[PDB]
Amino acid sequence: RATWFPGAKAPPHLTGEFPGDRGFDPVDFAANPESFERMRASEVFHGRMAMLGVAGCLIPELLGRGVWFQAGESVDAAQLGLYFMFLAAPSEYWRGNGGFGWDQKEKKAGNRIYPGFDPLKMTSDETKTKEIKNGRLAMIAFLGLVSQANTTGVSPFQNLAAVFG
Amino acid sequence: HHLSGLLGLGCLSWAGHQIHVSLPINKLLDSGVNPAELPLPHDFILDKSLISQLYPSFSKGLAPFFTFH
Amino acid sequence: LWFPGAKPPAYLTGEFPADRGFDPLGLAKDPATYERMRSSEVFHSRLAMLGVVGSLIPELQGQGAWYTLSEKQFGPGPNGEVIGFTELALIGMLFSYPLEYWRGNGGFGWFEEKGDRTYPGFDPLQLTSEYTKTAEIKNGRLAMSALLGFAVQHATTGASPLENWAATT
Ligand SMILES: CC1=C(C#C/C(C)=C/C=C/C(C)=C/C=C/C=C(C)/C=C/C=C(C)/C=C/[C@@]23O[C@]2(C)C[C@@H](O)CC3(C)C)C(C)(C)C[C@H](O)C1
Numbered sequence: 001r002a003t004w005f006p007g008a009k010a011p012p013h014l015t016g017e018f019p020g021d022r023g024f025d026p027v028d029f030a031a032n033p034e035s036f037e038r039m040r041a042s043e044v045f046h047g048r049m050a051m052l053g054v055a056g057c058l059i060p061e062l063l064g065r066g067v068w069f070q071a072g073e074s075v076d077a078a079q080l081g082l083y084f085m086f087l088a089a090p091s092e093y094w095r096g097n098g099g100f101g102w103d104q105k106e107k108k109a110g111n112r113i114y115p116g117f118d119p120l121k122m123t124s125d126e127t128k129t130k131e132i133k134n135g136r137l138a139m140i141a142f143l144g145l146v147s148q149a150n151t152t153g154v155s156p157f158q159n160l161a162a163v164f165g
Numbered sequence: 166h167h168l169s170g171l172l173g174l175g176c177l178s179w180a181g182h183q184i185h186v187s188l189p190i191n192k193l194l195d196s197g198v199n200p201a202e203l204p205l206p207h208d209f210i211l212d213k214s215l216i217s218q219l220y221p222s223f224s225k226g227l228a229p230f231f232t233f234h
Numbered sequence: 235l236w237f238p239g240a241k242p243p244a245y246l247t248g249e250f251p252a253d254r255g256f257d258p259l260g261l262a263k264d265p266a267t268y269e270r271m272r273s274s275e276v277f278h279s280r281l282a283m284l285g286v287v288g289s290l291i292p293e294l295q296g297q298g299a300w301y302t303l304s305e306k307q308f309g310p311g312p313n314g315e316v317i318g319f320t321e322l323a324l325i326g327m328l329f330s331y332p333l334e335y336w337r338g339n340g341g342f343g344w345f346e347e348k349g350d351r352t353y354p355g356f357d358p359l360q361l362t363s364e365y366t367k368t369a370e371i372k373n374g375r376l377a378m379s380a381l382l383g384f385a386v387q388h389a390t391t392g393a394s395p396l397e398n399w400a401a402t403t
């Protein structure tokens with residue numbers, strides 16, 4: 001199989017079964033298959049949130065709203081944050097629990113990674129891979145945004161301008 | 166693990182503390198700055214202007230590091 | 235029982251503590267919903283017992299009231315930060331994310347946890363007994379009543395609850 005480095009063998013617990021598997025788990029975080037489930041959950045969620053984060057950072061600046069690290073000087077962030085926490089706290093508790101219910105068998109019921117929203121029915125393993133590969137690229141780019149902010153102190157698109165002049 | 170982790174990362178971490186906390190505070194103190202009116206250590210991290218006055222290279226941030234300059 | 239001329243409704247059988255035979259609208263019908271109910275009762279109960287004292291004691295010392303926590307500027311911090319109730323609530327929500335998740339989960343993992351969730355393990359003097367299990371719920375029912383009392387007394391009169399108690403003594 002193809003791997004994250006030219007001639008590297010895969011770990012034995014990574015067998016290509018799950019989407020995104022390019023044989024990369026050196027510190028064996030996922031030898032136990034329950035921990036591999038949790039990690040898969042975490043990777044898809046971190047993944048999605050970074051897509052919304054990156055799009056939340058770039059797309060407004062294109063449609064003339066401002067630079068993403070100057071966002072809280074034109075809004076009242078403390079307020080919004082409280083509302084954001086008020087929408088999250090049920091919603092993330094349901095996602096963790098598996099559904100609405102004080103029983104523990106609730107966690108077995110339902111999917112906490114792929115809950116089943118799909119109205120145009122295009123969930124495959126080639127599309128599950130696309131989520132994860134877009135997600136990983138958004139995570140990596142978010143770390144680039146923060147870093148450039150700190151170093152250059154200017155807009156992310158103005159960092160792209162300096163590449164070409 | 167003991168070479169790369171315990172001693173390696175241990176030295177990296179402690180160089181990190183030195184660069185970001187021990188070097189400013191000592192530099193200011195050696196120029197007679199009365200410890201009561203010294204900035205707290207995070208202030209060197211949050212406000213890069215404080216640490217820029219002392220060491221101007223910080224104004225270039227991490228770009229030199231990544232371009233091997 | 236809550237009422238002398240009342241009879242215990244089936245499921246309520248005096249097994250669990252503070253069962254004073256009382257469920258008119260039949261909300262603890264299923265024995266599994268009675269589990270949630272019980273956990274919610276002891277949670278609401280503990281929060282109220284912390285609420286009453288946390289509303290009176292600053293009032294008595296001279297800070298304010300159960301009301302007027304809004305428009306208060308909580309401040310002199312280490313760097314001279316001064317923040318408002320909104321920021322303080324945001325802090326409270328940020329530091330309540332993992333504590334509440336872990337109490338709602340039973341533990342720390344993505345799978346089944348054996349962790350009580352109603353009466354967790356914290357008793358370094360071994361004082362847990364039916365007396366005390368009862369006494370916590372009873373005091374907390376009182377305290378819940380008292381907090382509803384605070385609310386409506388301030389709603390009707392517009393006075394602070396120490397002044398309303400000084401208008402009876
Ligand atoms: C049992 C039963 C029934 C019932 C019932 C009953 C009576 C239910 C009652 C519910 C009730 C009464 C539940 C309240 C809880 C209060 C909480 C959570 C306290 C938090 C509040 C806190 C933590 C306080 C915080 C503060 O003080 C601080 C720290 C500083 C102050 O400056 C500001 C405030 C004040 C904010 C039916 C319906 C009749 C029929 C059914 O069949 C059977």
Ligand SMILES: CC1=C(C#C/C(C)=C/C=C/C(C)=C/C=C/C=C(C)/C=C\C=C(C)/C=C/[C@@]23O[C@]2(C)C[C@@H](O)CC3(C)C)C(C)(C)C[C@H](O)C1
Nearest residue numbers: 025026027028049050052053056057068071139140142143
């Ligand atoms: C996989 C693996 C390993 C690894 C690893 C690696 C490389 C991990 C890397 C993880 C990485 C890089 C994860 C980034 C997440 C970023 C998020 C959540 C971004 C944004 C989140 C949001 C919501 C953004 C919000 C906002 O932007 C909005 C929307 C508008 C702005 O105005 C304001 C703000 C900024 C608030 C080992 C350890 C090497 C070995 C092991 O064996 C296997």
